[PDB]
Design a protein around this ligand. Sequence first.
Ligand SMILES: [Mg+2]
Ligand SMILES: [Mg+2]
Ligand SMILES: [Mg+2]
Ligand SMILES: [Mg+2]
Lengths: 603, 603
Amino acid sequence: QGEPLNFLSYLQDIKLNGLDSYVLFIGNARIWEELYLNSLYLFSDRGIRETVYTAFSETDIDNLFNKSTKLGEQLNAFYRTDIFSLGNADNVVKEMTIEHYNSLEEKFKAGYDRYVTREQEKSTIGAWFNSTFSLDNTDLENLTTIEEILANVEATNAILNNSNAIVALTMCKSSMDAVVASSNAMDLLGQYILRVTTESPVIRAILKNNVIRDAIINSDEAMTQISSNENSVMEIFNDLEATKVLVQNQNSINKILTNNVTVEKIIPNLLEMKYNLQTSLNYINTIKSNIASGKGQIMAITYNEEIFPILKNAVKNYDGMETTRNISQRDIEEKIKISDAILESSIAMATFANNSIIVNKVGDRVGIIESIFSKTVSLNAFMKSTTAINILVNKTTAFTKIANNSTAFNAMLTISENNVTIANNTTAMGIIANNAQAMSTVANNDTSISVFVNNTTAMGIIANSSTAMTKITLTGLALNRMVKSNTAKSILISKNSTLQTYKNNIQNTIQGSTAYFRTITGFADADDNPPQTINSTYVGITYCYGYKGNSYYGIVYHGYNTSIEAGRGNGYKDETKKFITLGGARYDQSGDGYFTYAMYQAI
Amino acid sequence: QGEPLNFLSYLQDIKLNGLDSYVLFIGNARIWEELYLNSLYLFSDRGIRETVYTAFSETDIDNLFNKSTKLGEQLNAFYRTDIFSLGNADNVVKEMTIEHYNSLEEKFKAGYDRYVTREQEKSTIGAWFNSTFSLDNTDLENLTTIEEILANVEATNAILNNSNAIVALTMCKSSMDAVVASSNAMDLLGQYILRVTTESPVIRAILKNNVIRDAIINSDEAMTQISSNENSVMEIFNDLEATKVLVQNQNSINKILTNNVTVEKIIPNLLEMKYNLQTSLNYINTIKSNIASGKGQIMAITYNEEIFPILKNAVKNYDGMETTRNISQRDIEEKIKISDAILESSIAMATFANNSIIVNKVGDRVGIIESIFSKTVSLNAFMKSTTAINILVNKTTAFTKIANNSTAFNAMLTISENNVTIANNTTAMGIIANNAQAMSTVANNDTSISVFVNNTTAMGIIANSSTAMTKITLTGLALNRMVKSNTAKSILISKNSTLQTYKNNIQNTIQGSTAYFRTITGFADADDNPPQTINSTYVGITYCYGYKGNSYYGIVYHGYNTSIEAGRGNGYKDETKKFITLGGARYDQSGDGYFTYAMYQAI
Ligand SMILES: [Mg+2]
Ligand SMILES: [Mg+2]
Ligand SMILES: [Mg+2]
Ligand SMILES: [Mg+2]
């Protein structure tokens, strides 16, 4: 037999009774201790593991650390590993690393902390560090508090450059509390990171350690060091939780943005990434169905309700492909989360929205603006930044994507100054004016259409776009605002034929939309010239023809410029001899003409 | 008698905890071994059997075979039987048969294999054989390799005349390889080994030597043995070159067809396989493009002209998928080759074409007939087998597929007896007559149409098919043969309206195809009744109308039965009052009628 029989009976009763076992009653602690100090089976019996971990009191963990002559073997059995050194707690602490420490559960982490505190409080902290890890530093020897150690750079680095001593230093709650409090220690810690940045396991283990991670990312000093090395920052964005901590600290964001490589290459790649990753994930999920089908072809050939033996490998291969594929999927789904952690941070997005290098990258790189559109926070941050729009209005591809995304377009138009920025850009206005959806949004947005029709550039382009005109001439609001604009009246009167193209749309919209137009003069016949009226809010509709259908002409000119003819006509009254006038009207005759005329006003 | 208490506690913990028991943790292997080497209760406790079998590592089974002094008792308890001899592994091996070996589960079969390999590959192979199976041979005692044994005739004969020693020999890959390698290999296989075992290892080792393979596959004796074991035959079709040798020997094909499992299950699967494999290969090649695209998405995110480090794994994963996929592809491409080796063998195909079980499988199983169509040899073998066609004419789906495949249809019609078989089958004739493509092939095939139009069944169906008729009435050859047929003339004159439906087709085909029709009498007008002519190869075309367009009737009757009216007409000459007569014509009038008539003859 390996262990005594009563130990086996104790394990049986623990399995059968959980925490209700007589073994785990406080009154029987004496035997319970004897078990966990001497049994290996207790720590290798997974079927009771959940109970055992719960049963361990703080005193029990202290007893383990202080008394067990095989704490290493018991930890190795308890975590199904071999990473811990054999023997008592001193052998375990001597070979402990941050990675191996992170493999521990909470109770054993706390046990490590308390044990190291006890051992330091026996002798002195400096002498304990020096002798335990053989740091061979006499300066450290005579230091009696953690503050005295942090005042000495030589001793601090002697500790930090030891994989085990750093675990002792960082994972002792009080000691760590001093390190966070010291402005100098943080700096040294930051420098430590820079040295390890190319030892991938070490840096990854550091970033998976919540205490060190959180202290480093939120430290002004440490980040200052780390930001200088783009490859260190790279490792932070390779870890989801570290990224989540980072994108919630304004100061650390600014710090990493002090590095030109980070700004130019790392951040745009992190933004561009989600689009490429989602596309790759679509291909992965297509491969899943293709694997299922190709395997189903093989499965259909049966032999005693089993696979046809000659094809057995063909099945196994298809399963292998399904394994690796699944792996791929997981990995990709992880990286997307990282992107989502960045895109969902208003702190990180707003800042990026006011950085001109990053916004130029958004404009230049296919995929970044798609990723930005994939989240509300990132979308609003960029669409509502007048700086970002001021840059992006010159990026035709990105701005076309904005104009086609109704949500991003509407978000962009919530800022008036963005409307002004757009109006003064010939390219952008050219895109919008020839986009039926966008022009539909603009025509029903008072601010946007009011800015556009009163801007010489935008209104110049709109007048040359049959799409935009159409929409505007069918919308009461837009037609009202356009009629009131002197810029629009001037441009349209210089392009009279374009104006008259939409005479029916204009008549119908004016007469229909009483919310935006009122009648000044109902239709009336006139043998002699009616008195001219000039008012920059007026719209006239005038039938010109001859008296009793003779061959003499009625002529109508715009009110906003009474020298520009809007139209003329002889013969009989007719829908083709009916003309729109802007800003009023002036009436004239060549011979005995005749008019049937009405006047309206934009409210 | 009785087992120690800790063993009972171990069994109890195994029951309570399954694989989570401390007993089954690798770190406690020492006690686990001590259990399974010394306990029978472990092997007779059915309540934990599934766990125990799962817990056994390869090393554990090796330890059992090497060290247990009661392997026989433990095997008997574990399989609730008495077939294994008592004592250690040597006693068990001494009485082992193929029957008892096959009753073992995979782990213990593998254990037997590894144990006998270890014992034979030592320098005590001769002594082990000698003592284990009680061969009373002192020469064998001192032989140290299998080659030294095969050089000695006495020792070989001592071993081979023991069936169990042969089992031990055959389950050891290297030893078997020597037997295949030995100069008198054939003899040894013929006289001793094959009689006792045709199992998979034997056939596998035989197939690695081209000479021994070819001799075995072409041996009437050996095949007779091998054919009785369907799983041995399975191993031959799992090897391309062995299949290529097999499908070139008529006698060996017949031998393997003496096994009903081979005929009913193995051969149809080998035939059905190519279709499923080609479909799976299409899916594989789609996966190739999907992997390329999904990887290209990741490759586009660069950093100093290298992959963005955060995505490095995403690249490797995509390469891994490309590795496994490629493996899959090769394997599938191999199996197709095997199918092609079978389909391209006229010997193997012809034989299968005259096996009613296999032909019924061809008719019943989707995929087999496509595979057969995929190769010229296999297609011609089945389409030209009158037995196969005699079965397939009753398989509606398969025969429709034949009728739609122009190549298979044309191949089938090269055999006259196949035409006879089809003509007398209502189903088949129903499919062909309503298939415009097939009827096109038939109408231009002298033999097929000649058989069809002279058969009361086929000709009965053709007369009711507007498709078939159409084709026939537009083809000189077919119309000639149909006109000459007395069966067809009888059926068609009994269906006079159906005949007259195609009067224009018939007129055009007769006048156009001078190769198949000649004019006896050019069109001529007639006031009085022309003299009747009767000839079973004649076709008449007769316009019937009134004299000078009056309301009196001309009437025309068929020559083959001068009492059956073909048509009548009054008024003026007209294309609707024109009638076909078969076998000659008889003319009559109701009042002063009038005719314009011509007579033709099928050459
Ligand atoms: Mg007048
Ligand atoms: Mg006048
Ligand atoms: Mg007459
Ligand atoms: Mg007459």
